[PDB]
Design an enzyme around this catalytic site. Structure first.
Site, PDB file in Angstrom:
ATOM      1  N   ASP A   1       0.810  -1.192   0.000  1.00 49.18           N
ATOM      2  CA  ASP A   1       0.000   0.000   0.000  1.00 49.18           C
ATOM      3  C   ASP A   1       0.858   1.264   0.000  1.00 49.18           C
ATOM      4  OD1 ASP A   1      -1.664   2.189   1.584  1.00 49.18           O
ATOM      5  OD2 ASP A   1      -3.042   0.692   0.743  1.00 49.18           O
TER       6      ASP A   1
ATOM      7  N   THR B   1       5.407   6.959  -6.104  1.00 51.55           N
ATOM      8  CA  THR B   1       5.314   6.422  -7.454  1.00 51.55           C
ATOM      9  C   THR B   1       4.268   5.314  -7.529  1.00 51.55           C
ATOM     10  OG1 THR B   1       7.160   4.820  -7.176  1.00 51.55           O
ATOM     11  CG2 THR B   1       7.743   7.019  -7.870  1.00 51.55           C
TER      12      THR B   1
ATOM     13  N   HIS C   1      -7.568  -2.457   7.082  1.00 54.36           N
ATOM     14  CA  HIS C   1      -7.793  -1.903   8.418  1.00 54.36           C
ATOM     15  C   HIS C   1      -8.626  -2.816   9.305  1.00 54.36           C
ATOM     16  CE1 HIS C   1      -7.031   2.559   7.089  1.00 54.36           C
ATOM     17  NE2 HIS C   1      -5.944   1.806   7.058  1.00 54.36           N
TER      18      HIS C   1
HETATM   19  C1  HEM Z   1      -1.774  -1.036  12.741  1.00 59.49           C
HETATM   20  C2  HEM Z   1      -2.074  -0.988  11.402  1.00 59.49           C
HETATM   21  C3  HEM Z   1      -2.391   0.337  10.617  1.00 59.49           C
HETATM   22  C4  HEM Z   1      -2.473   1.637  11.088  1.00 59.49           C
HETATM   23  C5  HEM Z   1      -2.222   2.091  12.542  1.00 59.49           C
HETATM   24  C6  HEM Z   1      -2.820   2.496   9.920  1.00 59.49           C
HETATM   25  C7  HEM Z   1      -3.010   3.897   9.934  1.00 59.49           C
HETATM   26  C8  HEM Z   1      -3.348   4.722   8.865  1.00 59.49           C
HETATM   27  C9  HEM Z   1      -3.578   6.178   8.849  1.00 59.49           C
HETATM   28  C10 HEM Z   1      -3.495   7.160  10.031  1.00 59.49           C
HETATM   29  C11 HEM Z   1      -3.888   6.532   7.570  1.00 59.49           C
HETATM   30  C12 HEM Z   1      -4.252   7.935   7.025  1.00 59.49           C
HETATM   31  C13 HEM Z   1      -5.796   8.245   6.889  1.00 59.49           C
HETATM   32  C14 HEM Z   1      -6.146   9.499   6.408  1.00 59.49           C
HETATM   33  O1  HEM Z   1      -5.767  10.546   7.050  1.00 59.49           O
HETATM   34  O2  HEM Z   1      -6.833   9.587   5.371  1.00 59.49           O
HETATM   35  C15 HEM Z   1      -3.851   5.306   6.821  1.00 59.49           C
HETATM   36  C16 HEM Z   1      -4.073   5.217   5.505  1.00 59.49           C
HETATM   37  C17 HEM Z   1      -4.113   4.106   4.723  1.00 59.49           C
HETATM   38  N1  HEM Z   1      -3.930   2.790   5.115  1.00 59.49           N
HETATM   39 FE1  HEM Z   1      -3.538   2.333   6.925  1.00 59.49          FE
HETATM   40  N2  HEM Z   1      -2.965   1.700   8.772  1.00 59.49           N
HETATM   41  C18 HEM Z   1      -2.729   0.397   9.189  1.00 59.49           C
HETATM   42  C19 HEM Z   1      -2.777  -0.736   8.389  1.00 59.49           C
HETATM   43  C20 HEM Z   1      -3.077  -0.820   7.077  1.00 59.49           C
HETATM   44  C21 HEM Z   1      -3.139  -2.036   6.346  1.00 59.49           C
HETATM   45  C22 HEM Z   1      -2.853  -3.464   6.989  1.00 59.49           C
HETATM   46  C23 HEM Z   1      -3.486  -1.700   5.005  1.00 59.49           C
HETATM   47  C24 HEM Z   1      -3.689  -2.670   3.781  1.00 59.49           C
HETATM   48  C25 HEM Z   1      -3.567  -4.057   3.861  1.00 59.49           C
HETATM   49  C26 HEM Z   1      -3.632  -0.268   4.972  1.00 59.49           C
HETATM   50  C27 HEM Z   1      -3.961   0.519   3.906  1.00 59.49           C
HETATM   51  C28 HEM Z   1      -4.073   1.925   3.975  1.00 59.49           C
HETATM   52  C29 HEM Z   1      -4.357   2.749   2.769  1.00 59.49           C
HETATM   53  C30 HEM Z   1      -4.584   2.265   1.367  1.00 59.49           C
HETATM   54  C31 HEM Z   1      -4.352   4.208   3.247  1.00 59.49           C
HETATM   55  C32 HEM Z   1      -4.574   5.504   2.357  1.00 59.49           C
HETATM   56  C33 HEM Z   1      -3.128   5.943   1.852  1.00 59.49           C
HETATM   57  C34 HEM Z   1      -3.001   7.175   0.965  1.00 59.49           C
HETATM   58  O3  HEM Z   1      -2.970   8.371   1.370  1.00 59.49           O
HETATM   59  O4  HEM Z   1      -2.902   6.881  -0.237  1.00 59.49           O
HETATM   60  N3  HEM Z   1      -3.373   0.245   6.256  1.00 59.49           N
HETATM   61  N4  HEM Z   1      -3.523   4.234   7.618  1.00 59.49           N
HETATM   62 CA   LIG Z   2       6.084   2.935  -5.728  1.00 55.43          CA
END
Ligand code: HEM
Ligand SMILES: [Ca+2]
Ligand SMILES: *[C@@H]1O[C@H](CO)[C@@H](O[C@@H]2O[C@H](CO)[C@@H](O[C@H]3O[C@H](CO)[C@@H](O)[C@H](O)[C@@H]3O)[C@H](O)[C@H]2NC(C)=O)[C@H](O)[C@H]1NC(C)=O
Ligand SMILES: *[C@@H]1O[C@H](CO)[C@@H](O[C@@H]2O[C@H](CO)[C@@H](O[C@H]3O[C@H](CO)[C@@H](O)[C@H](O)[C@@H]3O)[C@H](O)[C@H]2NC(C)=O)[C@H](O)[C@H]1NC(C)=O
Ligand SMILES: *[C@@H]1O[C@H](CO)[C@@H](O[C@@H]2O[C@H](CO)[C@@H](O)[C@H](O)[C@H]2NC(C)=O)[C@H](O)[C@H]1NC(C)=O
Ligand SMILES: *[C@@H]1O[C@H](CO)[C@@H](O[C@@H]2O[C@H](CO)[C@@H](O)[C@H](O)[C@H]2NC(C)=O)[C@H](O)[C@H]1NC(C)=O
Ligand SMILES: [Cl-]
Ligand SMILES: [Cl-]
Ligand SMILES: [Cl-]
Ligand SMILES: [Cl-]
Ligand SMILES: [Cl-]
Ligand SMILES: [Cl-]
Ligand SMILES: [Cl-]
Ligand SMILES: [Cl-]
Ligand SMILES: [Cl-]
Ligand SMILES: [Cl-]
Ligand SMILES: [Cl-]
EC number: 1.11.1.7
Length: 595
Positions: free
Chosen positions: A108, A184, A351
């Site tokens: 991701d 990227t 998530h």
């Molecule tokens: C303890 C585990 C995780 C934490 C604490 C975490 C935390 C966060 C936070 C704070 C954001 C930003 C949200 C926002 O302000 O819009 C985010 C975005 C995201 N997370 Fe997680 N995340 C976790 C695990 C995962 C996992 C396991 C995946 C996929 C298998 C994932 C995929 C994503 C994606 C696709 C975004 C949006 C990214 C962007 O700006 O393009 N996350 N996460």
């Molecule tokens: Ca990349």
């Protein structure tokens, strides 16, 4: 008709075209369209944006204007009534290791990143927002519904700032608002090396001509390296324990310290680079630093693509894998490689796979210490537990031996994330990731649930009875209808994740379609895909299809017992074998000769 341009936040320099290496910014992958897939460009739109004023205002911003006739329910309320649950008992995935969740967050971060808008630090609007919850400009508060326990304890809202967009960064108007992707689009390990030249260079050890990556000088993991500490004070990592004062790590991506297990994976990759780098010098003494660095960077990029496409995706998509991602057939220069806006929300399904605790295991996989099982929320931006409390090995054993959380319609997102999320800007462990996802969904101007079902050629329920049938759940459908009034208004994030899983996969039919298309596109539209003839030699390729996460563990940690298939649920000690039993990456095909 077309708005074929704006372009300031858009990095810029010439293409070599004969260089056998990817650039840092992703530029020059596609020769006909050079900026295609590059970082700091806008996220692609597979469907037209849907804003309240059709231009930039998100739905719910103006409290008198509806969406399809109804008010959009508060993000936090949807979080409270549908996403939360109390009992963690029986929520674990009986056939997916904790590594399954962790690899997804890696992939991701290699693919997308839509950073929040700035408009200065020394600001008092960053204060006007968390402090008074005044909506306006880029502050878009997540208000608390009546009867929320946080009202009594946290205030009236959770600050939230809109995501950055193109053309500028400041006061904009014209075309429809389009968010930035600061990384990227190609699966190229940019999370390890960086997406900007500036940052790529700072991560490198430009003293020795060994093409190694800079490592921590203040601490070592039993003779093994740690990522260097971040320059930046104030630091969130030291804020969560001002006595240990252990700063955040510095890596190719800024989210590296977001949680201890993600920092652990980053460390494994940085170590593998150095290993490959000095192992290569051993075969090609004449090669210089640049060469050592680029040739290593290339192997690592191929490594990440292989595990992902060979071991990871088949167990996410399940039987829908072949439907969206047909066998590789060669580079297609007409394929749009860029990450779409919707993908960055569809990939957030991960998530609901995060469990509420992280464990540390001892040498032969026993509880490491007395405070071995830690609550997830004490680990956000926690780097001192790695430096001062055992190194990464104990955390790595837990990734193999423990399980991922299973998505459940009646138990979606653990409270460790839904009520106690820690945000780097702020001071409390009181944020809600689920509410954030939904408020963000709207911030990015995402079309509703049904627009995406149509896009994927799937039925579009208009009634309660229809929604029950698709979700195969009477109670969930009811709650959704009560909050949204019409399926047309359901935010894609929760709508997509509310669907039952496809055979052998971990996502429903809508998500599988969205995820599937994107991955097919970045493989096919990548000139440097490891299988594209001429990128690696046939012998270099026979040697690469032998890699595995297990091996990566064996070569870069002091663990000696590992499962063969690290991604599926494994029970110690039966499923575990000795390291010398696992295939090594044979590097001889990378040796050269003079005359
Ligand atoms: C303890 C585990 C995780 C934490 C604490 C975490 C935390 C966060 C936070 C704070 C954001 C930003 C949200 C926002 O302000 O819009 C985010 C975005 C995201 N997370 Fe997680 N995340 C976790 C695990 C995962 C996992 C396991 C995946 C996929 C298998 C994932 C995929 C994503 C994606 C696709 C975004 C949006 C990214 C962007 O700006 O393009 N996350 N996460
Ligand atoms: Ca990349
Ligand atoms: C736990 O999860 C595993 C994956 O969901 C599952 O086994 C997987 O099932 C696939 C079915 O295609 C098998 O994969 C390979 O099987 C043969 C090898 O015998 C190959 O020739 C095929 O090409 C195919 O790729 C494996 O059996 C396995 N997948 C992998 C990558 O190992 C387990 O059965 C699940 N356990 C339970 C109890 O459900
Ligand atoms: C902030 O970080 C502190 C250190 O970085 C951490 O304290 C450390 O952890 C425990 C204290 O609870 C001690 O561990 C054990 O060490 C030996 C046993 O091997 C004995 O002295 C004791 O039995 C002790 O339990 C560390 O010595 C301790 N180090 C220091 C300098 O205090 C804190 O727990 C962290 N605090 C927070 C709020 O996160
Ligand atoms: C850059 O690489 C050099 C070469 O390995 C590192 O220097 C070695 O590091 C330790 C000392 O901290 C010992 O192995 C030797 O004293 C050094 N060896 C040589 C040949 O100089 C150096 O630490 C690296 N610098 C960074 C910032 O990562
Ligand atoms: C390369 O990928 C493109 C899509 O990016 C494919 O384009 C299709 O072209 C056919 C005609 O050959 C048209 O029917 C469609 O309009 C296009 N389909 C899509 C989904 O855009 C094309 O099939 C691929 N080209 C090769 C040679 O494989
Ligand atoms: Cl989109
Ligand atoms: Cl409520
Ligand atoms: Cl090392
Ligand atoms: Cl350092
Ligand atoms: Cl993050
Ligand atoms: Cl592959
Ligand atoms: Cl806490
Ligand atoms: Cl219907
Ligand atoms: Cl399965
Ligand atoms: Cl071990
Ligand atoms: Cl596996």
């Amino acid at each position: 008709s077309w708005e074929v341009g704006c372009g300031a936040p858009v990095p810029l320099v010439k293409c070599d075209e004969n260089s056998p290496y990817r650039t840092i910014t992703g530029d020059c992958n596609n020769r006909r369209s050079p900026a295609l897939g590059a970082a700091n460009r806008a996220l692609a739109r597979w469907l037209p944006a849907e804003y309240e004023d059709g231009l930039a205002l998100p739905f719910g911003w103006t409290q008198r204007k509806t969406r399809n006739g109804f008010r959009v329910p508060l993000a936090r309320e949807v979080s409270n009534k549908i996403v939360g649950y109390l009992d963690e008992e029986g929520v674990l995935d009986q056939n997916r290791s904790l590594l399954f969740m962790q690899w997804g967050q890696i992939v991701d971060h290699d693919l997308d990143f839509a950073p929040e808008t700035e408009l200065g630090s020394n600001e008092h609007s960053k204060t006007q927002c968390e402090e008074y919850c005044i909506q306006g400009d880029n502050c878009f508060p997540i208000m608390f519904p009546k009867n929320d326990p946080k009202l009594k304890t946290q205030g009236k809202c959770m600050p939230f700032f809109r995501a950055g967009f193109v053309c500028p960064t400041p006061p904009y108007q014209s075309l429809a608002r389009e968010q930035i992707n600061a990384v990227t689009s190609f699966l190229d390990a940019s999370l390890v090396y960086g997406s900007e030249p500036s940052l790529a260079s700072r991560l490198r050890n430009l003293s020795s001509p060994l093409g190694l990556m800079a490592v921590n000088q203040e601490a070592w993991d039993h003779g093994l390296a740690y990522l260097p500490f971040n320059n930046k004070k104030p630091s969130p990592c030291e804020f969560i324990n001002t006595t240990a004062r252990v700063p955040c790590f510095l890596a190719g991506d800024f989210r590296a310290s977001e949680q201890i297990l993600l920092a652990t994976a980053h460390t494994l990759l940085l170590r593998e680079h150095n290993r490959l780098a000095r192992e290569l010098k051993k075969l090609n003494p004449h090669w210089n630093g640049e060469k050592l660095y680029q040739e290593a960077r290339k192997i690592l990029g191929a490594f990440i693509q292989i595990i992902t496409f060979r071991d990871y995706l088949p167990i996410v998509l399940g039987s829908e894998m072949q439907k969206w991602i047909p066998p590789y057939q060669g580079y297609n220069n007409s394929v749009d490689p860029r990450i779409s806006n919707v993908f960055t929300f569809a990939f957030r399904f991960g998530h609901m796979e995060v469990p509420s605790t992280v464990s540390r295991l001892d040498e032969n996989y026993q509880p490491w210490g007395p405070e071995a099982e830690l609550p997830l929320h004490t680990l956000f931006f926690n780097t001192w537990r790695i430096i001062k409390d055992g190194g990464i090995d104990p955390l790595v054993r837990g990734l193999l031996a423990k399980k991922s959380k299973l998505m459940n319609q009646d138990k979606m997102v653990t409270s460790e994330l839904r009520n106690k999320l820690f945000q780097p800007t702020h001071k409390i462990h009181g944020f809600d990731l689920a509410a954030i996802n939904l408020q963000r969904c709207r911030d990015h101007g995402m079309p509703g649930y049904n627009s995406w079902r149509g896009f994927c050629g799937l039925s579009q329920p208009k009634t309660l009875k229809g929604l029950q049938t698709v979700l195969k759940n009477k109670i969930l459908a009811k709650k959704l209808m009560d909050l949204y009034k019409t399926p047309d208004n359901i935010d894609i994030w929760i709508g997509g994740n509310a669907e039952p899983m496809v055979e052998r996969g971990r996502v429903g039919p809508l998500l599988a379609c969205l995820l599937g298309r994107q991955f097919q596109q970045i493989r096919d539209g990548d000139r440097f895909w490891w299988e594209n003839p001429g990128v690696f030699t046939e012998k270099q390729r026979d040697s690469l299809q032998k890699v595995s996460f297990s091996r990566l563990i064996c070569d870069n940690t002091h663990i000696t017992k590992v499962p063969l298939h690290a991604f599926q649920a494994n029970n110690y000690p039966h499923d575990f074998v000795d390291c010398s039993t696992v295939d090594k990456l044979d590097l001889s095909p990378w040796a050269s000769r003079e005359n």
